[PDB]
């Protein structure tokens, strides 16, 4: 890799600079280089990895949705033939997005997940695995879409099982996992009732545990709880 010659600490430092400069492709390349040093990642470093790739894939997803919409309009009754260009360009963006998802999944498989023993690291990485399979599912058609959906589900479910046994109901990693699994149910798996039930139960169990928290932890947990509530308002 092009980052093989740079010190691990320098890659981390530069990822933080790239974040400040809103250079998320650079940030992701630096964090990929850091992962490939082979050492486990601290909490802060896991968060840098996630921020970098979420921002990269976020731009790709937004672009894909714009293009896919134009393409669907182009395939309506009464629309003019404009050639293969819309499809080609949507496919170009789609392929780049799938490449980023495959890169992230490859880092998780080689070897972040297998070395992650603490609940906070293991749940974080399994949630990431579910998320990037979910992003693949958003663009999937044809004969592997069911398997991609099942891969997302399986990762989220393993993360949920650990989180419920090992973390309090207000833990922000647990909350963000449940939030994203509920989105999977609603948006990917055609299971809106499951999504609503999960969001409700997650919110209520967190509410009942807020009394145990410091002011700063209360702010972290309630921020994610509000996202659960926002989705419930959208979905009901």
């Amino acid at each position: 890799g092009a980052m093989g010659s740079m010190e691990r600490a320098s890659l981390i430092q530069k990822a933080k600079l790239a974040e400040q400069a809103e250079r998320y492709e650079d940030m992701a390349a630096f964090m990929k280089g850091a992962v490939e040093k082979g050492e486990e990642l601290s909490c802060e470093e896991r968060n840098l990895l996630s921020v970098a790739y979420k921002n990269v894939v976020g731009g790709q997803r937004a672009a894909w949705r714009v293009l896919s919409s134009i393409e669907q309009k182009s395939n309506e009754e009464g629309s003019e033939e404009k050639g293969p260009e819309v499809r080609e360009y949507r496919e170009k963006v789609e392929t780049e997005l799938q490449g980023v998802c495959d890169t992230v999944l490859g880092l998780l498989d080689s070897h972040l997940i297998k070395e992650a023993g603490d609940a906070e690291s293991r749940v974080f990485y399994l949630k990431m695995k579910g998320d990037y399979y979910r992003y693949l599912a958003e663009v999937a058609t044809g004969d592997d879409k069911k398997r991609i959906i099942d891969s997302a589900r399986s990762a989220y479910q393993e993360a949920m099982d650990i989180s419920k046994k090992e973390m309090p109901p207000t833990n922000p990693i647990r909350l963000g996992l449940a939030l994203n699994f509920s989105v999977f149910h609603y948006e990917i798996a055609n299971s809106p009732e499951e999504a609503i039930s999960l969001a409700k139960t997650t919110f209520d169990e967190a509410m009942a545990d807020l009394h145990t928290l410091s002011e700063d932890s209360y702010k972290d947990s309630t921020l994610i709880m509000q996202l659960l509530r926002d989705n419930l308002t959208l979905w009901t």
Binding site: C43, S50, Y53, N55, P172, V183, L227, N231
Partner: peptide, 10 residues
């Protein structure tokens, strides 16, 4: 669109 988690969690 549904809201998903922020990238940074503690």
């Amino acid at each position: 669109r549904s809201h998903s988690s922020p990238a940074s969690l503690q």
